């Protein structure tokens, strides 16, 4: 399925993922696409910070859902 | 708009507030108050790595675990109005 | 003493028994809720959802959301006896 | 260290364990000593159900603690 990842500046990447994808895998895909080190990525969905070892299905992320990307400064 | 649970970005009701992610919610033995164990955004001398009164309830980095009453917390207002790329209602186009 | 994992009883007629799988405060509610997994299916139970939002996952019709303040440590298990007492524990601390 | 496992009917057994042992490890030890399949075992300590992939240390289970064994015979 396809999800969106949108930074606080509106910069958006589209990712092909499976519900079984771990958050760390999502972070690695983001680094590949935009080059942001995973350690800097805070991924947010439904008011929650996503943790590396969980899956997208653990957070009930849906087709075309938007994850928000906040960078650690 | 999403309430408070484990994983929630939270702010503690202080002037000014500070921020942490809820890592654990529970009422420990001997307390009649529901507590949130928070991982703070920035180190704080004295804070633990996820222990409360000798019991470990999660693991953070040293100096960044803080246990507060859940009622002392609210959703992190810095991120509570982030907007999605697309929305279900938009499908309606008549 | 109620945490995720606690065996809980809900006072009722008959009292429900379950394991706490989730503790939190959903949007709109002024008190903290426990999400319990019951042993058997119940009318009005879900599979982990409360007012449409999923908070955990269990079998169909086994999830019950109840005010934490209305749960108590399961009285049946609270009544089982340890092999070793606190007197023996105190003795161990010294010798 | 030594812990106890007591069935609801009061049959008690001692186990030799380590704080770092997993709950699944403890269930395997009960299977080895008593014959009870691990997937039938529901282990309770201090009012909480013990989950398979956590350690005794995670639950702060001390020497001479008593775990209670409920069987899921269904």
Residue numbers in the entry:
A (entry chain C): 1 to 73
B (entry chain D): 467 to 560
C (entry chain B): 469 to 563
D (entry chain A): 1 to 74
How do the authors describe this structure?
The deubiquitinase CYLD in complex with SPATA2 is recruited to receptor signaling complexes by the ubiquitin ligase LUBAC and regulates Met1- and Lys63-linked polyubiquitin and receptor signaling outcomes. Upstream of its C-terminal catalytic domain, CYLD harbors three cytoskeleton-associated protein glycine-rich (CAP-Gly1/2/3) domains, which are ∼70-aa SRC homology 3 (SH3)-fold protein interaction domains known to bind to microtubules (Yan et al., 2015). Here, we report that the CAP-Gly2 and CAP-Gly3 of CYLD are novel UBDs and demonstrate that CAP-Gly3 is indispensable for full CYLD catalytic activity in vitro and for CYLD-regulated NOD2 signaling in cells. CAP-Gly domains comprise a five-strand β sheet topology and show similarities to SH3 domains; a subset of SH3 domains binds Ub (Stamenova et al., 2007).
A detailed understanding of how CYLD CAP-Gly domains bind Ub came from two crystal structures of the CAP-Gly3 domain bound to Ub determined at 1.7 and 1.9 Å resolution. To obtain crystals, we slightly extended the CAP-Gly domains C-terminally; crystal form 1 (aa 467–552, 1.7 Å) crystallized in the tetragonal space group P41212 and crystal form 2 (aa 467–565, 1.9 Å) crystallized in the orthorhombic space group P212121. Also, the Ub binding mode between the two structures is highly similar, with hydrophobic CAP-Gly3 residues Leu475 and Val487 engaging the Ile44 patch of Ub. In addition, hydrogen bonds are formed between CAP-Gly3 Arg488 and Glu507 with Ub Glu51 and Arg42, respectively. Interestingly, the extended C terminus of CAP-Gly3 (from aa 542–565) adopts two short helices, and Phe545 from helix1 forms further hydrophobic interactions with Ub Ile44. Chemical shift perturbation mapping of CAP-Gly3 bound to 3-fold molar excess of Ub revealed a comparable Ub interface in solution studies as compared to the crystal structures. CAP-Gly3 uses a central Leu residue, Leu475, and an extended C terminus with hydrophobic residues to bind the Ub Ile44 patch. Mutation of Leu475 to either Pro (as in non-Ub binding CAP-Gly1) but also Arg (representative of CAP-Gly2 and most other CAP-Gly domains) abrogated Ub binding without significantly perturbing the structure of the CAP-Gly domain. The chemical shift perturbations within labeled CAP-Gly3 upon NEMO binding mapped to a separate highly conserved surface, revealing that NEMO and Ub interactions are independent of one another.
